[PDB]
Design an enzyme around this catalytic site. Sequence first.
Site, PDB file in Angstrom:
ATOM      1  N   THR A  51      24.309 -24.837   3.772  1.00 35.45           N
ATOM      2  CA  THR A  51      25.012 -24.310   2.469  1.00 35.45           C
ATOM      3  C   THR A  51      26.255 -25.024   2.660  1.00 35.45           C
ATOM      4  O   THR A  51      27.122 -24.769   1.012  1.00 35.45           O
ATOM      5  CB  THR A  51      26.124 -22.994   2.653  1.00 35.45           C
ATOM      6  OG1 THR A  51      26.433 -22.793   3.373  1.00 35.45           O
ATOM      7  CG2 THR A  51      24.717 -21.934   3.109  1.00 35.45           C
ATOM      8  N   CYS A  81      22.564  -3.983  16.117  1.00 32.10           N
ATOM      9  CA  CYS A  81      22.324  -4.406  17.661  1.00 32.10           C
ATOM     10  C   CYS A  81      21.964  -2.890  18.235  1.00 32.10           C
ATOM     11  O   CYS A  81      21.619  -3.310  19.026  1.00 32.10           O
ATOM     12  CB  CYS A  81      23.124  -5.569  17.164  1.00 32.10           C
ATOM     13  SG  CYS A  81      25.263  -4.438  16.405  1.00 32.10           S
ATOM     14  N   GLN A  94      31.531  -1.813  22.089  1.00 33.94           N
ATOM     15  CA  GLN A  94      30.815  -2.422  21.827  1.00 33.94           C
ATOM     16  C   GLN A  94      31.190  -3.764  21.841  1.00 33.94           C
ATOM     17  O   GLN A  94      32.820  -3.906  21.417  1.00 33.94           O
ATOM     18  CB  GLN A  94      30.549  -2.261  20.316  1.00 33.94           C
ATOM     19  CG  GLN A  94      29.384  -1.031  19.976  1.00 33.94           C
ATOM     20  CD  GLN A  94      29.322  -0.580  18.921  1.00 33.94           C
ATOM     21  OE1 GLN A  94      28.632   0.099  18.398  1.00 33.94           O
ATOM     22  NE2 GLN A  94      29.024  -2.290  17.558  1.00 33.94           N
ATOM     23  N   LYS A 100      24.294   3.359  10.147  1.00 36.89           N
ATOM     24  CA  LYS A 100      22.705   2.663  10.953  1.00 36.89           C
ATOM     25  C   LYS A 100      21.466   3.721  12.389  1.00 36.89           C
ATOM     26  O   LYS A 100      20.548   3.092  11.541  1.00 36.89           O
ATOM     27  CB  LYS A 100      22.979   1.675  11.255  1.00 36.89           C
ATOM     28  CG  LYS A 100      23.531   0.730  10.137  1.00 36.89           C
ATOM     29  CD  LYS A 100      24.328  -0.420  10.831  1.00 36.89           C
ATOM     30  CE  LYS A 100      24.333  -1.467   9.279  1.00 36.89           C
ATOM     31  NZ  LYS A 100      25.363  -2.926   9.429  1.00 36.89           N
ATOM     32  N   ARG A 142      34.862  -0.040  19.295  1.00 39.97           N
ATOM     33  CA  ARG A 142      35.293  -1.449  20.060  1.00 39.97           C
ATOM     34  C   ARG A 142      35.939  -1.979  21.464  1.00 39.97           C
ATOM     35  O   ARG A 142      36.540  -0.300  21.726  1.00 39.97           O
ATOM     36  CB  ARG A 142      35.688  -2.058  18.521  1.00 39.97           C
ATOM     37  CG  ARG A 142      35.658  -4.205  18.752  1.00 39.97           C
ATOM     38  CD  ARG A 142      34.441  -4.527  18.987  1.00 39.97           C
ATOM     39  NE  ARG A 142      34.291  -4.279  17.435  1.00 39.97           N
ATOM     40  CZ  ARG A 142      33.294  -4.521  16.610  1.00 39.97           C
ATOM     41  NH1 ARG A 142      32.022  -4.805  17.117  1.00 39.97           N
ATOM     42  NH2 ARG A 142      32.650  -4.730  15.961  1.00 39.97           N
ATOM     43  N   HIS A 147      27.367  -4.766  24.563  1.00 36.91           N
ATOM     44  CA  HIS A 147      26.585  -3.493  24.267  1.00 36.91           C
ATOM     45  C   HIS A 147      26.657  -2.946  25.391  1.00 36.91           C
ATOM     46  O   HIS A 147      25.317  -2.614  25.766  1.00 36.91           O
ATOM     47  CB  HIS A 147      26.687  -3.397  22.853  1.00 36.91           C
ATOM     48  CG  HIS A 147      26.790  -3.612  21.929  1.00 36.91           C
ATOM     49  ND1 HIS A 147      28.176  -4.238  22.078  1.00 36.91           N
ATOM     50  CD2 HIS A 147      27.026  -3.574  19.873  1.00 36.91           C
ATOM     51  CE1 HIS A 147      28.423  -5.321  20.145  1.00 36.91           C
ATOM     52  NE2 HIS A 147      26.772  -4.896  19.912  1.00 36.91           N
TER      53      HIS A 147
HETATM   54  N1  LIG Z   1      27.259 -11.518  14.421  1.00 33.52           N
HETATM   55  C1  LIG Z   1      26.582 -11.092  15.740  1.00 33.52           C
HETATM   56  O1  LIG Z   1      26.740 -10.780  16.522  1.00 33.52           O
HETATM   57  C2  LIG Z   1      25.467 -10.770  14.794  1.00 33.52           C
HETATM   58  C3  LIG Z   1      24.664  -9.879  15.307  1.00 33.52           C
HETATM   59  C4  LIG Z   1      23.735  -9.455  14.532  1.00 33.52           C
HETATM   60  C5  LIG Z   1      23.144 -10.272  13.208  1.00 33.52           C
HETATM   61  N2  LIG Z   1      24.249 -10.969  13.130  1.00 33.52           N
HETATM   62  C6  LIG Z   1      24.128 -11.727  11.210  1.00 33.52           C
HETATM   63  O2  LIG Z   1      23.840 -12.920  11.118  1.00 33.52           O
HETATM   64  C7  LIG Z   1      24.543 -13.292  10.081  1.00 33.52           C
HETATM   65  C8  LIG Z   1      25.426 -14.174  10.670  1.00 33.52           C
HETATM   66  O3  LIG Z   1      26.136 -14.173  11.620  1.00 33.52           O
HETATM   67  P1  LIG Z   1      27.121 -15.162  12.302  1.00 33.52           P
HETATM   68  O4  LIG Z   1      28.212 -14.628  13.480  1.00 33.52           O
HETATM   69  O5  LIG Z   1      26.155 -16.525  12.586  1.00 33.52           O
HETATM   70  O6  LIG Z   1      28.056 -16.178  11.225  1.00 33.52           O
HETATM   71  P2  LIG Z   1      29.017 -17.133  11.184  1.00 33.52           P
HETATM   72  O7  LIG Z   1      29.236 -18.336  13.275  1.00 33.52           O
HETATM   73  O8  LIG Z   1      29.910 -16.782  10.682  1.00 33.52           O
HETATM   74  O9  LIG Z   1      27.968 -18.581  11.145  1.00 33.52           O
HETATM   75  C9  LIG Z   1      27.761 -18.435   9.853  1.00 33.52           C
HETATM   76  C10 LIG Z   1      27.003 -19.477   8.164  1.00 33.52           C
HETATM   77  O10 LIG Z   1      28.697 -19.862   8.493  1.00 33.52           O
HETATM   78  C11 LIG Z   1      29.008 -21.838   8.309  1.00 33.52           C
HETATM   79  N3  LIG Z   1      29.381 -21.552   9.294  1.00 33.52           N
HETATM   80  C12 LIG Z   1      30.994 -21.896   8.694  1.00 33.52           C
HETATM   81  N4  LIG Z   1      32.034 -22.210   9.482  1.00 33.52           N
HETATM   82  C13 LIG Z   1      30.737 -22.199  10.693  1.00 33.52           C
HETATM   83  C14 LIG Z   1      31.307 -22.942  12.579  1.00 33.52           C
HETATM   84  N5  LIG Z   1      32.577 -23.302  12.538  1.00 33.52           N
HETATM   85  N6  LIG Z   1      30.331 -23.036  12.920  1.00 33.52           N
HETATM   86  C15 LIG Z   1      29.252 -22.411  12.564  1.00 33.52           C
HETATM   87  N7  LIG Z   1      29.080 -22.004  11.284  1.00 33.52           N
HETATM   88  C16 LIG Z   1      29.676 -22.121  11.106  1.00 33.52           C
HETATM   89  C17 LIG Z   1      27.306 -22.309   9.123  1.00 33.52           C
HETATM   90  O11 LIG Z   1      26.865 -21.955   7.862  1.00 33.52           O
HETATM   91  P3  LIG Z   1      26.247 -23.822   6.707  1.00 33.52           P
HETATM   92  O12 LIG Z   1      26.235 -24.326   8.357  1.00 33.52           O
HETATM   93  O13 LIG Z   1      25.242 -23.313   6.073  1.00 33.52           O
HETATM   94  O14 LIG Z   1      27.717 -24.110   6.255  1.00 33.52           O
HETATM   95  C18 LIG Z   1      27.172 -20.969   9.921  1.00 33.52           C
HETATM   96  O15 LIG Z   1      25.003 -20.567   9.828  1.00 33.52           O
HETATM   97  C19 LIG Z   1      25.558 -12.288   9.171  1.00 33.52           C
HETATM   98  O16 LIG Z   1      24.270 -11.397   8.719  1.00 33.52           O
HETATM   99  C20 LIG Z   1      25.778 -11.308   9.991  1.00 33.52           C
HETATM  100  O17 LIG Z   1      25.849  -9.914   9.646  1.00 33.52           O
HETATM  101  C21 LIG Z   1      25.316 -10.975  13.243  1.00 33.52           C
END
Ligand SMILES: NC(=O)c1ccc[n+]([C@@H]2O[C@H](COP(=O)([O-])OP(=O)(O)OC[C@H]3O[C@@H](n4cnc5c(N)ncnc54)[C@H](OP(=O)(O)O)[C@@H]3O)[C@@H](O)[C@H]2O)c1
Lengths: 373, 372
Positions: free
Chosen positions: B38, B137, B164, B246, B269, B276
């Site tokens: 992105t 989760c 959590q 959920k 939390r 968790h």
């Molecule tokens: N967080 C959880 O524990 C968890 C658990 C279950 C499901 N999910 C789901 O998974 C999705 C993403 O979660 P996430 O926590 O993995 O998100 P995240 O770390 O914020 O990453 C999402 C996207 O943000 C961009 N990004 C911006 N700054 C970044 C950085 N410094 N390092 C890496 N990427 C960066 C990247 O896209 P680009 O490469 O395109 O820039 C990356 O793929 C959401 O839908 C969430 O609901 C999350």
Amino acid sequence: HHMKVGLVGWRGMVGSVLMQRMVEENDFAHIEPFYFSTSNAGGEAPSFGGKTAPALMEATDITSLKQMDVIITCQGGDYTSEVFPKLKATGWDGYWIDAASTLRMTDDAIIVLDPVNLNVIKDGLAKGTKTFVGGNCTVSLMLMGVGALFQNNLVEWMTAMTYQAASGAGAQNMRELLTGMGYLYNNTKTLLDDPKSAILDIDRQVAELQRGEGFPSANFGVPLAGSLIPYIDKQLESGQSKEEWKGQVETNKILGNSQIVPIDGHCVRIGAMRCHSQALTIKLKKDVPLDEIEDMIRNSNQWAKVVPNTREASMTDLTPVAVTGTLTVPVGRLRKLNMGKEYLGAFTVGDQLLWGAAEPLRRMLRILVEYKS
Amino acid sequence: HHMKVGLVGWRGMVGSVLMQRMVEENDFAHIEPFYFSTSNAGGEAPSFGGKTAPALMEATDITSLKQMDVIITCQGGDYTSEVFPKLKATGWDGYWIDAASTLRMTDDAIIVLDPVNLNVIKDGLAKGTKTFVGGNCTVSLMLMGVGALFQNNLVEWMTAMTYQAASGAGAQNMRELLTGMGYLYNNTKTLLDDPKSAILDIDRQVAELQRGEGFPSANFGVPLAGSLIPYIDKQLESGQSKEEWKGQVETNKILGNSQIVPIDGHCVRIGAMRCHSQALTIKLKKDVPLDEIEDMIRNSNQWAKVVPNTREASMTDLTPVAVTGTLTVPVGRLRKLNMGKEYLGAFTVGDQLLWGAAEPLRRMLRILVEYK
Ligand SMILES: NC(=O)c1ccc[n+]([C@@H]2O[C@H](COP(=O)([O-])OP(=O)(O)OC[C@H]3O[C@@H](n4cnc5c(N)ncnc54)[C@H](OP(=O)(O)O)[C@@H]3O)[C@@H](O)[C@H]2O)c1
Ligand SMILES: NC(=O)c1ccc[n+]([C@@H]2O[C@H](COP(=O)([O-])OP(=O)(O)OC[C@H]3O[C@@H](n4cnc5c(N)ncnc54)[C@H](OP(=O)(O)O)[C@@H]3O)[C@@H](O)[C@H]2O)c1
């Protein structure tokens, strides 16, 4: 005539909370305090609340203790186990107020939580009862919050999943928790100070630190900082821990119930300083309207509070940060649960050193003073 | 041939766990991977598993996405909402595997937790379902532990009080938690180094630090270090949080229940990194002997583990420290409760980034490669 009150264990953690609260309430205006010691008998005694006292007296000296009208002790169960039978054996007529659990389940003792069971305490005083003991912190805190449901006999049973603070284990366990917080951060600071560091590297280092020989865990036996421990106190043959076993027996004794209301659950230690929190599943005996449940809690005593079931109020008012070092006992997330109108969810938070330890004892002392004046 | 797999959100926290697990399992050996972005479209793509890929493709470009046999995305709900309707509209015949919650409750989507519902996944694949979404989760971790009780139709209802970890909120939330732990310790260190310091002084100082302006709470809104927060996600009209809501809908969709088993509780939390834990009151439809309940858990899948109900085993094996970064899902404190023999208590711990996020997605991808 002011009662002569002997203070034992005034120096420890629970005792220091008691002394602070007695100063805050000017409790010393109504008694003649005498300070006892297990280690410094003869040394200079404190002067809390502006009253001087003679030199420290030997806490184990039965002849010195027999001189008191009231003994209030935060010294511990080993102390009570040695001294109490010897003192009672002399025919001593006075009152014993105890933070230790030693005498809690003896027939001659009343567990005190006067905002909930003043009637039991006053009925006991009139019957000749001389021994008064604080209840387990988890039971006292739960009853300060939702005890009105039990007093109105609305509860068929309850499970309690707890989030217990390190203060329940002792002053050194609190210090260990904080030291472990510093151990984790300070040894990942170089990664954390870099915005571009990978969260999985930070996470890998934290787990290595928690698992390594260097982690300070002498008191808890395993890490608490960054973790939880789903076992508190000794193992029972039934599979309950002793902490969990206290729920049903102590609740029903505080209330004076002859028909036992079942109480059970898991007591889990978390990384908090001195507030216990409890997530409750309460089966009611009928479909009581939620607003009437809230009114019963709000009106039950001064210290119970109803936190509106909103994201913002829950985050700010229903946490250890909101409650720590106060006498406030918030109850929140109050809602009928998905399995039926008779299932009540509640989440409550209370300070473990106050309503869970020192405060029922100083309040019992004031009840005695008023009773005997 | 080797399917062409487009990976979206591979750079974030969940994506990075997914990539590591795929490298560990040599998942890239049987696929042809293509990396999307992105923010860095056109840049050089990674090469996990020793496999090279062309330049990074634009993650919102439907023309690029349509060339893939599979899209596996950890990018987020905002991404899925924007891109998924436009991609399906072009007639794209490929598979969509998603970490985000956006599509969980659509009729055309299946919630994947294959150690539990592999049968649901196989039936859907044969019926033509092309969209597969990981579960919440908390639901996935609970089902990996005690899901066999539900599969045996033994659960009348369940309440789940949760503990959590910060990872559920995000990487920056995890960093904030550690920073707050350091803030509390370092500003109380002078007291802590003196053995004669009064515990009430130490405690007064910690509370002041937690309540003051200097405490770093930008991401959680309130302190988490040394505290807890009994509210997660959006407030619903019922008073339930969205996190709590959920539980019931997702569990029953994963299992395939038409008769809904009620599930409720408080989602709280605590100050843990990425595991968790859940304290469960399980009302059984009949009195099942405890040892048979244990066997149901052991037999259900290879990652569930019964921790004997002892102080020592609970302290060392049933904790985030024991579980973090591993696929093990221990279940312990298993006991009949005081209100009757149909009441089962249980305590389970699971890694939120593995079974709670990345692992069901990479297993679903291997299911596809084996299927086709
Ligand atoms: N967080 C959880 O524990 C968890 C658990 C279950 C499901 N999910 C789901 O998974 C999705 C993403 O979660 P996430 O926590 O993995 O998100 P995240 O770390 O914020 O990453 C999402 C996207 O943000 C961009 N990004 C911006 N700054 C970044 C950085 N410094 N390092 C890496 N990427 C960066 C990247 O896209 P680009 O490469 O395109 O820039 C990356 O793929 C959401 O839908 C969430 O609901 C999350
Ligand atoms: N800990 C809790 O949160 C809690 C809660 C409810 C009930 N209780 C019960 O209350 C009793 C006391 O608990 P506690 O945690 O308050 O005990 P504590 O802090 O360990 O103090 C107990 C005694 O240890 C001695 N002591 C030794 N070194 C000390 C030091 N550096 N500073 C102060 N005192 C020191 C003191 O006796 P001398 O002055 O005679 O030397 C003090 O009165 C126990 O029965 C416990 O089960 C505890």
